[PDB]
Structure 1
């Protein structure tokens, strides 16, 4: 019957009530978020006199331990910011309340998935996509800081939030799936639509998997639709191949899961296994983006900053983000120097 003296539910989530007042400080307004970790609530902090977002972790050793790993990375990041110029969500403090670890974040506005939805999945402009792209690239540069070397490991539109609904400043949230660069412990990582080829191929990975995810995200922000909407891993890889061609032989020769997707011919060349799909490399990004045809579905014809020349810069940057080879794939520092950002 009763769990944690009536405070927790079946899933070990704290049962939130509007109007409750924790620690004579936080006035709970409403539930704004939910996930495997627990819940997120909007609350007014009476001491600092501002709204905050409190992430209430479930009352279970597994989720507690995961969330203390998130706390450690956040404090490590926020210790190399202070001025907050690098677009990571800011952890203010944490405390235990009725056996739930609570992380107090600055309160943010809508996420980029909500934006897509608000466009009816037709996308936002190239100008706004540039602004998100610039900030995300600066965030990834920050994460690559040697003493950090953090992989967010689950970048996707819903994990990118606007600071303010009338402005274009963004913050990355949810470092619960994140770890630093080390020996490979985990293999089933990233969200499928944004999952890198190295990961699909069971290969070793580094910070470059975040850059792959970013390429995918940026095209989606402009088209309204995911670049690669795989219903499973095989379909995911096939959708990547349609656009980018068969992965290079030197990669696939080292891939433990090569044969999940491809097959080695007697001459050492690799083709797709049949299971539907356009031939490899024939769903070109140039055409997906509508470089010469007025953008996605022609919806940006005549709009300023949407000329052929503007689109070719965007296209060229994304292809450098979607490089098959993680060692050749563009890095944050050089991405910021791309002509797309002039």
Structure 2
């Protein structure tokens, strides 16, 4: 009949209405996004006199507690980052309104998927990819602060927003599926395209799962297509193996879900389970990037900063990000000191 005196819908979301005024403060403009958490609306704040993005959580206990964990992480980050210089989206405040938790964020521009979409998935240049790579590594360095130890756990182009359309500044949004380092409670985390091997293999994991995601994300920004576009976990692992080969034996011996993907032959080596795919490590990243053939699709031939020497700096950095072992996979601090950012 009527849910929350007619304010909500069957799905517990607030029925957003153009031009509604909340608390004599926020003038609601339009719906900009929707998620399982609920909705995101564009609004004008008449006290601060600026546009804001409001995340209106569903009126239900499961999402209210989830959103509360995000609110805890953002208010903890805002405490450390006062100067607003570590590339995380700023939570201005939060309030309860008609039985909905509302989060007030700074208004940013489109996401990195939208930029890829406007190219018809042909990608952006390497100069712009470097600027996104530099800011993202700085952001992961901030999350690796020992008192934070925050894992975003769902890094992808949609969850990276541009501050301003005419600038290269980006901020990471959406810490709803994020957590601080600790004992393993969850194994089904990260979006499949961006999911680390340790998660695919069902193994212990830490903040290095974000660095794997970042490696996948940076190649997609320049090529325009997902590096590993698995339709299922078995497809995801096979496409990872296509590029990087079979994970080391000492990892697959410890992986619980190792036999979901590989067979252990009588001699001790691990082989792919028969199901198509190129043999392991033959779809070279060297050839995917087109280090010697003028970039992806030859569409970067003759462009500045797109030489073979420049592509090898990017290839090396990306390979260090896609290290199978999370203990030896490159960390934000060392990645920033790479020759690619020189």
Report the TM-score, using the length of structure 2 for normalisation: 1.00
Aligned to 2:117: 117
Aligned length: 342
Q: CA RMSD in A?
A: 0.3
Aligned to 1:335: 335
1:292: how far off? 0.2
- Give the Cα–Cα distance (whole angstroms) in 2 for the partners of residues 120 and 38 of structure 1: 29
- Give the Cα–Cα distance (whole angstroms) in 2 for the partners of residues 261 and 148 of structure 1: 34
Q: Report the 3-state secondary structure (helix = DSSP H, G, I; strand = E; otherwise coil) of the residue aligned with 2:42.
A: strand
1:160: how far off? 0.3
1:176: how far off? 0.3
- Give the Cα–Cα distance (whole angstroms) in 1 for the partners of residues 323 and 69 of structure 2: 31
Q: Could you report, residue by residue, the CA deviation over 1:208-254 in whole angstroms, capped at 9, with x for unpaired residues?
A: 00000000000000000000000000000000000000000000000
Instruction: Specify every segment of 5 or more residues in structure 2 that has no aligned partner in the other structure, as ranges.
Output: none
- Give the Cα–Cα distance (whole angstroms) in 2 for the partners of residues 221 and 73 of structure 1: 28
Q: Report the 3-state secondary structure (helix = DSSP H, G, I; strand = E; otherwise coil) of the residue aligned with 1:286.
A: helix
- Give the Cα–Cα distance (whole angstroms) in 2 for the partners of residues 166 and 332 of structure 1: 27
1:137: how far off? 0.1
Q: Report the 3-state secondary structure (helix = DSSP H, G, I; strand = E; otherwise coil) of the residue aligned with 1:294.
A: coil
1:322: how far off? 0.1
Q: Report the 3-state secondary structure (helix = DSSP H, G, I; strand = E; otherwise coil) of the residue aligned with 1:5.
A: coil
Q: Could you report, residue by residue, the CA deviation over 1:106-132 in whole angstroms, capped at 9, with x for unpaired residues?
A: 001000000000000000000000000
1:142: how far off? 0.4
Q: Report the 3-state secondary structure (helix = DSSP H, G, I; strand = E; otherwise coil) of the residue aligned with 2:5.
A: helix
Report the TM-score, using the length of structure 1 for normalisation: 1.00
- Give the Cα–Cα distance (whole angstroms) in 2 for the partners of residues 91 and 303 of structure 1: 39
1:126 aligns with 2:101: no
1:107 aligns with 2:107: yes
- Give the Cα–Cα distance (whole angstroms) in 1 for the partners of residues 157 and 322 of structure 2: 17
1:11: how far off? 0.6
1:70: how far off? 0.3
The residue correspondences of 1:293-312 to structure 2 (distance < 5 A) are: 293-312=293-312
Aligned to 2:74: 74
Aligned to 2:86: 86
- Give the Cα–Cα distance (whole angstroms) in 2 for the partners of residues 103 and 19 of structure 1: 19
Structure 1 runs (4+) greater than 3 angstroms displaced? none
Q: Could you report, residue by residue, the CA deviation over 1:242-272 in whole angstroms, capped at 9, with x for unpaired residues?
A: 0000000000000000000000011110000
Q: Could you report, residue by residue, the CA deviation over 1:56-102 in whole angstroms, capped at 9, with x for unpaired residues?
A: 00000000000000000000001100111000000000000000000
1:333: how far off? 0.3
Q: Report the 3-state secondary structure (helix = DSSP H, G, I; strand = E; otherwise coil) of the residue aligned with 1:131.
A: helix
- Give the Cα–Cα distance (whole angstroms) in 1 for the partners of residues 10 and 314 of structure 2: 48
1:30: how far off? 0.1
Aligned to 2:44: 44
Q: Could you report, residue by residue, the CA deviation over 1:279-309 in whole angstroms, capped at 9, with x for unpaired residues?
A: 0100000000000000000000000000000
- Give the Cα–Cα distance (whole angstroms) in 1 for the partners of residues 332 and 281 of structure 2: 26
Aligned to 1:57: 57
- Give the Cα–Cα distance (whole angstroms) in 2 for the partners of residues 102 and 301 of structure 1: 48
- Give the Cα–Cα distance (whole angstroms) in 2 for the partners of residues 182 and 258 of structure 1: 23
Instruction: Specify every segment of 5 or more residues in structure 1 that has no aligned partner in the other structure, as ranges.
Output: none
Q: Report the 3-state secondary structure (helix = DSSP H, G, I; strand = E; otherwise coil) of the residue aligned with 1:130.
A: helix
